[PDB]
Design an enzyme around this catalytic site. Structure first.
Site: not given
Ligand code: ADP
Ligand code: ADP
Ligand code: ADP
Lengths: 516, 517, 520, 98, 107, 65
Positions: C54, C87-88, C385
């Site tokens: 996270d 947030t990443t 989230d």
């Molecule tokens: N199920 C999925 N399939 C493909 N791409 C995804 C999926 N979920 C998220 N992403 C892509 O990954 C990026 C970050 O995903 P995630 O790690 O879930 O959120 P965060 O990085 O904010 O924790 C997003 O910008 C999105 O475009």
């Protein structure tokens, strides 16, 4: 090969530390063993050749080297003789393992191979031994006497040896029982007198006095053991005694006598006419007021007795430990015919209680002597006599000394390895060559050539028998069977048994981990 | 000033090394203990000399050693779960997981992503799990065959233990305990008595759930139709588990008042107990001799000095209840026991039950020279009862000695033929990690592992899904004929727990350490 | 004073040193981007250990002494309130813009001119997102598709095995505590708890409050259906202090007298419960055997040993007041609830007090179950989230296709518009395009594919194949066009990402000197 | 037999490095192309190869790429024979320069 | 590559002679695989002549003739079909003269 | 050791080592036989060289100054 990971460095680390302890204790083997100088940290210095005493005063820090020290203690408990020969055998086997491990042989294959040599080794020594009759007190006398001549005391062996022969035959069924308990024969000694004055008491003998008690005699005593301290009221927690006037101060004395007498009344109900008070120093074990009440009840005072001395009293009369007066009862009582404290010229104030009348086989030896050293070596010699006799009870056999068992063992094992297949051949041959360190050490101490002595004896054993061994009294090879220099079979068997298990244990060490 | 004053951070280059170097070290630590010819190991705590000991148990080595690396602590905690839960496979999990990370470090050196490695290992674990399922052999009928399998599994668990020399005697004790159970595999019903004296071969057995406790001073040696009432409270004297409360003492009369006041309190509590209408009383705290005669007058068996396991185990063996408090009568379940007889094994009075409700329980009586012998005897024996109880709940069995590990590794290599590109190279390393298990069992025994292990590949590749390592002779033989087999759930959990453990390390790429307090 | 040994760093070298500090935090977090992100091992100061991917949890535990890094960590407190999940995306985009800026500082451009270009390119990109967006619940309030969006969110967490059930409760929870028409969902009204045991499929919604506290006696009624709850500070018994009573009984003369006064207070207050009309009496402290013996005869359940903040939440949830003493009781100070039950957990004696409302409420608690505490911990954030995903869709149902589709489309618009800016901000606009590509180029890297080939292949597909944007298949699904994969991110989230990223780059660029006095 | 099995794999592993090096020099992902050829030839498809023009796998029979049999046979034999000589050597004796 | 792997095996306590026994057995199975994969042309000489162009295109790779490699595939194959005898290229002359592009090569 | 044990336990006639990885030991079947004069001079020349080396305890050579 690359040999990136090197766990073998811990084997060479344990073998070197193990071989170091053997190389030091090697020269002190036999009657002609070269003495060694030990210096305590305070400044005191001493000289001795007993290998057991040297290992204790070495302060061994390595784990593998400590296994040889604990190994030597196992030989003392089991056999009581051959303490130095064990550590020398283990050091040579590990030194021989250093040659096998370089050849690419695994420790497990070396470990399993040595067990086969041990299995065949015990058969070799047992076949060439000399069986004896245990009920025959003639063989036990000359066996311990000739062996005690090799010990420190050579003149007074004829007196202390048969005292131990009768002590064992008395409590042990001759030629029926196989196990013997040395703890069942206590050895008491006091200054004054001489070694000729001794008494094998059938009951028990202690060292403490029953003073200030004035009873001095209790016939038909039901001896009991109580560990709780009999005294006035005491509380470890925060408390305060109240005293309003001189009457309350004197009343507490009347109430203090009651608390001591209340616990005595419960003891009086059980018929316990003699009490064994465990030795205690943290608090008053028996106050002054308790003496007269016990004198009123005609109880003999026995206090300041050691637990090991109580352990001898446990099996002797069948008394159990009582941690509280509430648990004290009649079933936990021993017995005695006539209790008394004798005060002879040299024997001292001894507590002689005869006629136990209980299931048990025990005796006790009274000893006298001018100096402390005169009586000290008397008891040290009785132990070695009892130990060597104990070796004959478990293993009714004899074998020659002078390292002759090691030569017959090394000679026939080399023939046994020719019939074996696989890595066991070189592993068993190395087991045979390791035995030759003992007689070569005896020959070195006797001024002879270490090689030509064992080299000549290996031919005399191929042609003759185990009678051929090194005779240090004459300074050369002689027929040891004629010299009457023999040892029991348990010493040579337990040595190979315990030494090989230590070598197998040290071989199985892959590495050591430091915890916290 | 990014991370100073205790706080540290390992970058992707270093954290990738520290994560594997910490986990691989724990594997190479205790891989020598794998197999019946396992190598011993010394444990010596720094600063103290009395902590010396020697052992070849992979579980005991990991419990005592401390771990500062977080990657290694995960692999060690995942191993302790196998020891407490399953009781077997603690060493194979640590070795199989470490060998996977050792191969993975070579894959990432080839610019293979950790996520690409995890995808292959998930597909390999399915094919590997499917191999055991097909080769597993259950026994619903032929209890003799099922009883023989429990004897073989008992020897495998007891291998490289203190009881390995006389395992033929203990295989009859552990199997008879689980065979007499024949139902729910609750090890609570299987008591283990530990008493001094005698060699390991002198271990007796009792099917009436023998106890390791003596009771009272003069208790009846036989009671007919005893009703069990267990309890947990102070019953010896006053001020039980109370510290700080004192009592004024001006003369011995007040002590006699305490004696009367004590007898008054013991009287009322003995009244409430007997109001239930019972014939047998058990309490964790000791029973003073005064209430003993009050129970003795009522013919109630005054059991004293029970432990936590005693209350936990006797409640189900006799079908009773804990029932700590006994204020109100006739509101707790009284047990069921026909006879509570006295038995003497090892010069000690023991409590022998009989005809109890759900009387499938038993007890194994160990015998040894000291307590260190009996403690390790209980641990390795309890480990056998764990997998043996699991073998009753799941009768499936698989061949050990490198047969199961090599069979799973073959299916993975077959799966490598039908798979995308990078997943093939990752799944090939999953097979090599499984093949390194018999390689270590052969190396520790001194046999040529490259010859035996490579021979098993040619064996399993062309039929013959039974070949394994024969540690007795040092060659290959049919595991079924030689009588070597292990439970299916054990090898299943060993495969999954090892893959799940290594999967966590690859997902990690940066260790964060803040300023320690 | 304390000028000696004063740390100092100024000039253009300081700006590159500040950029090097931000890149260290971005390169650390770009690996944990996406559902296939690599986890991070945390070594707590007290010896505890955990693993998670996270972005917010990584920044919270990351102990960074550099001042520029602390500002990047402070952005998480403002970002998680709006987005929660990615947030990443802000830290990776911020570090990417700073890395590309380092190529512009060598060209001789001022840092403020770089910040002026990113702010111009952000409005270009933010304007582009409003065009290519799409709605879900335009002009009607519905629950069918809204639940499906949250189901793909929890799939990124360890709770993916039980992602389908928690999504329905998440929609009813937010819809209960607030209306979609109101467009005001408060996280303070929402609480999440849990306990070891069971599985994540046993997640339940309790409209009210739940506290791990048991009744005064097991013989109490296990169901208080009537809505009359008393919340006192002391129990209905003889009044006692907060720590210890220490009653002085010298002899039996005082016992029979004080016992009468004590027994009178037992009957007086226990009977006062039915005087005010209260059925349940919640008290901060426990009850004596004499009290529970009288409560049973009157059928008056009561709770014991309730905590400090627990007594506050029960008053808010049930609508009562924290009564200081029994003399202040009244009809208005009694709480309201539809059903009070005692729910145990298998063989554990927790027995948490479950206060149900039996109707729609304004505050709802979420009870989680599982076989591990740390998985329950990560499960709690998995809904936080999801609450933002639901809250963001409620504030604006318009959304943009995720999986990198939005970043690649904006990069084309920013690149074309850069030709229309004849000024030194042009180089910064092109740098904004390349920085936008780092998010999707990081997803393909974390999945184990060639980044640049997968990046440019989707670009030409977004230019040649079709006008609707297309994402990256990081989950190794069938193909691109994440609309088919139902991977859609919120519009307010993407706008806050580019906004908070440009702000974080602007703040670090306008800083050119750090000063701090050292130990003298 | 046992030890000979490990030596055969290194012989196959060496042959697999030829398309690995051909793909690496061209800039393509050699791990995917070579591992895909292995998965292909293991189940039929004994005509697959590398396509340096398009940068993927294709049927050599269709694309029209082939090499002489006598050339590949000598490459296999000359390499194994040359490696056999070096592997058989264990000591080098250097004499004095003249 | 064979020696690079053999160096690794020697580190694993594997003898060089044992490795040669495996490589000799492996060379047999490898040659057998080539024969089963080889496809001769006893008939259809046009198919054979088409293959000779592929041998020239494969052999001429990585050379300076990549600009007009398609032209040299015809010349080398054409000159070989004229020989119809032993492989002695002494009968086949080669001329090296400047001027003109590579596609202007005559036969 | 396996060949040596076969020379005693299995059978008294001498048996060799199968170095060419043929069927088995007993080189008489494999037709691998050396001359008696060969072996007699082999161990004789070897012993004579050992005695000549053992009876040398000083290699003196003057150095260049
Ligand atoms: N199920 C999925 N399939 C493909 N791409 C995804 C999926 N979920 C998220 N992403 C892509 O990954 C990026 C970050 O995903 P995630 O790690 O879930 O959120 P965060 O990085 O904010 O924790 C997003 O910008 C999105 O475009
Ligand atoms: N009088 C003797 N004559 C010849 N050999 C002896 C004599 N006394 C002891 N030995 C030999 O010395 C060895 C060691 O004997 P001893 O001193 O009793 O044991 P340790 O040396 O272990 O204390 C024995 O193996 C024995 O054969
Ligand atoms: N008789 C046997 N023959 C061959 N292999 C055995 C035998 N007994 C045990 N093993 C092997 O020893 C390994 C370890 O067994 P065990 O000690 O029960 O588990 P752990 O080492 O994890 O505690 C197992 O993988 C098993 O294959």
């Amino acid at each position: 090969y690359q040999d990136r990971d090197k766990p073998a460095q811990i084997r060479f680390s344990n073998i070197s530390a193990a071989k170091a302890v053997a190389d030091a204790i090697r020269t002190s083997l036999g009657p002609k063993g070269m003495d060694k100088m030990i210096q305590d940290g305070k400044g005191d210095v001493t000289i001795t050749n007993d290998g057991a005493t040297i290992l204790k005063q070495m302060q061994v820090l390595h784990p593998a080297a400590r296994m040889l020290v604990e190994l030597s203690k196992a030989q003392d408990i089991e056999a009581g003789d051959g303490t130095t020969s064990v550590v020398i055998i283990a050091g040579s086997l590990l030194d021989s393992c250093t040659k096998l491990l370089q050849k690419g042989i695994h420790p497990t294959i070396i470990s399993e191979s040595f067990q086969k040599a041990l299995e065949k080794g015990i058969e070799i020594l047992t076949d060439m031994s000399r069986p004896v009759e245990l009920s025959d007190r003639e063989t036990l006398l000359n066996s311990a006497t000739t062996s005690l001549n090799s010990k420190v005391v050579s003149q007074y062996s004829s007196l202390l040896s048969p005292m131990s022969v009768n002590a064992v035959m008395k409590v042990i069924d001759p030629a029926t029982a196989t196990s013997v308990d040395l703890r069942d024969i206590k050895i008491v000694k006091k200054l004054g007198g001489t070694i000729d004055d001794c008494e094998l008491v059938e009951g028990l003998v202690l060292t403490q006095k029953v003073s200030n008690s004035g009873i001095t005699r209790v016939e038909k005593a039901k001896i009991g053991l109580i560990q709780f301290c009999l005294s006035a009221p005491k509380t470890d927690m925060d408390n305060q005694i109240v005293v309003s006037d001189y009457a309350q101060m004197d009343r507490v004395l009347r109430e203090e006598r009651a608390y001591i007498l209340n616990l005595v009344k419960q003891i009086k109900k059980t018929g316990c006419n003699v009490l064994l008070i465990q030795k205690s120093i943290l608090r008053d074990a028996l106050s002054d007021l308790a003496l007269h009440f016990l004198n009123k009840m005609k109880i003999m005072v026995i206090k300041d007795i050691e637990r090991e001395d109580i352990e001898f009293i446990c099996k002797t009369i069948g008394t159990k430990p009582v941690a509280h007066i509430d648990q004290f009862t009649a079933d936990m009582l021993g017995s005695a015919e006539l209790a008394e404290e004798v005060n002879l010229n040299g024997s001292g104030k001894l507590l002689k209680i005869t006629g136990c009348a209980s299931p048990g086989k025990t005796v006790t030896i009274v000893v006298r002597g001018s100096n402390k050293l005169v009586i000290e070596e008397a008891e040290r010699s009785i132990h070695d006599a009892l130990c060597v006799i104990r070796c004959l009870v478990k293993k009714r056999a004899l074998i020659a000394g002078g390292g002759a068992p090691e030569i017959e063992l090394a000679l026939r094992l080399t023939e046994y390895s020719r019939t074996l297949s696989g890595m066991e051949s070189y592993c068993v041959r190395a087991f045979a060559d390791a035995m030759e360190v003992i007689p070569s050490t005896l020959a070195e101490n006797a001024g002879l050539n270490p090689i030509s002595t064992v080299t000549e004896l290996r031919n005399r054993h191929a042609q003759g028998e185990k009678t051929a061994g090194i005779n240090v009294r004459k300074g050369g090879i002689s027929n040891i069977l004629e010299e009457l220099v023999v040892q029991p079979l348990l010493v040579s068997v337990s040595a190979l048994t315990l030494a090989t298990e230590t070598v197998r244990s040290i071989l199985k060490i892959d590495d050591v981990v430091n915890t916290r | 000033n990014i991370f100073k004053a205790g706080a540290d951070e390992e970058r992707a280059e270093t954290a990738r090394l520290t994560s594997f170097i910490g986990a691989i070290a724990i594997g190479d630590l205790v891989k020598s203990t794998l197999g019946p010819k396992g190598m011993d190991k010394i444990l010596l705590s720094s600063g103290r000399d009395a902590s010396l000991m020697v052992t070849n148990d992979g579980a005991t080595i990991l419990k005592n050693i401390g771990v500062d690396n977080p990657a290694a602590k995960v692999l060690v905690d995942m191993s302790r779960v196998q020891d407490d839960e399953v009781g077997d496979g603690t060493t194979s999990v640590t070795v199989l997981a470490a060998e996977l990370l050792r191969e993975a470090e070579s894959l990432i050196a080839k610019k293979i992503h950790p996520q690409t490695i995890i995808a292959g290992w998930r597909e390999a674990t399915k094919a590997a799990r499917e191999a055991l399922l097909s080769s597993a052999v259950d026994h619903g009928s032929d209890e003799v065959k099922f009883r023989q399998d429990l004897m073989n599994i008992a020897g495998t668990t007891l291998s490289s233990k203190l009881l390995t020399h006389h395992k033929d005697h203990f295989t009859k004790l552990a199997v008879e305990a689980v065979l007499r159970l024949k139902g729910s595999g609750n090890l609570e019903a299987i008591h283990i008595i530990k008493k001094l004296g005698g060699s390991l071969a002198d271990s007796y057995l009792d099917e009436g759930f023998l106890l390791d406790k003596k009771i009272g001073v003069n208790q009846p040696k036989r009671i007919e139709n005893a009703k069990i009432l267990i309890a947990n409270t102070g019953m010896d004297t006053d001020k039980i588990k109370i510290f700080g409360s004192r009592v004024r003492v001006d003369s011995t009369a007040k002590v006699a008042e305490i004696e009367h006041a004590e007898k008054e309190k013991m009287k009322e509590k003995v009244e409430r107990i007997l109001k239930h209408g019972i014939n047998c009383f058990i309490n964790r705290q000791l029973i003073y001799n005064y209430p003993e005669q009050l129970f003795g007058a009522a013919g109630v068996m005054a059991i004293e000095h029970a432990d936590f396991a005693g209350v936990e185990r006797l409640a189900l063996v006799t079908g009773g209840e804990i029932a700590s408090t006994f204020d109100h009568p006739e509101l707790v379940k009284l047990g069921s026991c026909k006879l509570i007889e006295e038995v003497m094994i090892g010069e000690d009075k023991l409590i022998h039950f009989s005809g109890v409700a759900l009387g499938e329980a038993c007890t194994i009586v160990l015998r040894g020279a000291t307590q260190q012998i009996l403690d390790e005897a209980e641990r390795s024996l309890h480990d056998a009862l764990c997998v043996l109880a699991q073998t009753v709940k799941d009768s499936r069995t698989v061949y050990g000695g490198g047969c199961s590990e090599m069979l799973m590794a073959h299916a993975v290599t077959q799966l490598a033929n039908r798979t995308p590109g990078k997943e093939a190279v990752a799944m090939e390393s999953y097979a090599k990690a499984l093949r390194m298990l018999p390689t270590i069992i052969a190396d520790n025994a001194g046999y040529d592992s490259a010859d035996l292990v490579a021979q098993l590949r040619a064996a399993h590749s062309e039929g013959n899904t039974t070949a394994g390592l024969d540690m007795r002779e040092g060659t290959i033989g049919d595991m079924a004929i030689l009588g070597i087999t292990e439970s299916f759930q054990v090898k299943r959990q060993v495969l999954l727990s090892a893959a799940e453990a290594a999967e966590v390390i690859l997902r990690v790429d940066n260790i964060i350490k803040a300023a320690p307090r | 004073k304390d000028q000696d040994r004063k740390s100092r760093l100024m000039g253009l070298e300081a700006l590159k040193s500040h950029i090097m500090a931000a890149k260290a935090v971005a390169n650390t977090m770009r690996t944990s981007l996406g559902p296939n992100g690599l986890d991070k091992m945390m070594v707590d100061k007290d010896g505890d250990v955990t693993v998670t991917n996270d972005g917010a949890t990584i920044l919270s535990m990351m102990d960074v002494d550099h001042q520029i890094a602390k500002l990047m960590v402070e952005l998480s407190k403002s970002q998680d309130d709006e987005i929660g999940d990615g947030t990443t995306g802000v830290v990776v985009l911020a570090g990417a813009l700073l890395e590309e800026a380092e190529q512009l500082l060598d060209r001789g451009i001022h840092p403020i001119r770089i910040a002026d270009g990113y702010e111009q390119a952000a409005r270009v990109a933010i304007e582009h997102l409003d065009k290519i967006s799409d709605s879900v619940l335009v002009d009607i309030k519905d629950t069918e598709p809204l639940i499906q969006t949250a189901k793909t969110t929890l799939g990124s967490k360890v709770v993916n095995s039980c992602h389908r059930q928690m999504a329905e409760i998440a929609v009813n929870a937010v819809l209960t505590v607030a209306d979609m028409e109101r467009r005001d969902v408060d996280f303070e009204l929402i609480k999440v708890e849990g306990k070891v045991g069971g599985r994540l499929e046993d997640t339940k919604l309790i409209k009210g409050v739940i506290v791990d506290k048991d009744f005064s006696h097991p013989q109490m009624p296990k169901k208080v259906e009537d809505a009359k709850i008393a919340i006192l500070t002391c129990p209905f018994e003889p009044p006692k202090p907060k720590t210890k009573h220490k009653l002085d009984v010298t002899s039996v003369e005082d016992y029979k007298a004080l016992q009468k006064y004590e027994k009178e207070k037992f009957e007086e207050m226990i009977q006062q419960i039915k005087e005010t009309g209260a059925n349940l009496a919640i008290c901060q402290w426990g009850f004596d055997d004499e009290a529970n013996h009288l409560l049973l005869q009157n059928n008056l359940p009561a709770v014991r040993w309730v905590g400090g903040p627990e007594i506050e939440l029960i008053a808010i949830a049930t609508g009562g007041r924290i009564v200081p003493r029994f003399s202040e009781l009244t009809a208005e100070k009694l709480g309201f609830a539809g059903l009070v039950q005692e729910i145990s957990f298998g063989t554990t004696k927790d027995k948490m007090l479950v206060i149900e409302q039996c109707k729609n409420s304004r505050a709802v608690t979420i009870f989680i179950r599982g076989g591990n505490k740390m998985i329950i911990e990560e499960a709690k954030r998995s809904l936080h989230d999801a609450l933002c995903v639901i809250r963001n869709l409620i504030r604006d149902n318009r959304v943009v296709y995720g999986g990198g589709a939005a970043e690649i489309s904006c990069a084309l618009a920013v690149s074309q518009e850069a030709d229309k800016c004849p000024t030194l901000e042009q180089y910064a606009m092109r740098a904004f395009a390349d920085a936008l590509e780092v998010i999707p180029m990081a997803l393909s890297e974390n999945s184990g594919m060639n980044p640049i080939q997968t990046m440019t292949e989707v670009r030409a597909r977004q230019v040649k194949e079709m006008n609707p944007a297309l994402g990256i298949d990081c989950l190794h699904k069938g193909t691109n066009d994440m609309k088919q994969q139902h991977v859609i991110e919120t519009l307010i989230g993407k706008k806050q990402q580019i906004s908070l990223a440009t702000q974080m780059v602007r703040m670090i660029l306008k800083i050119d000197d750090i000063r701090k006095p050292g130990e003298s």
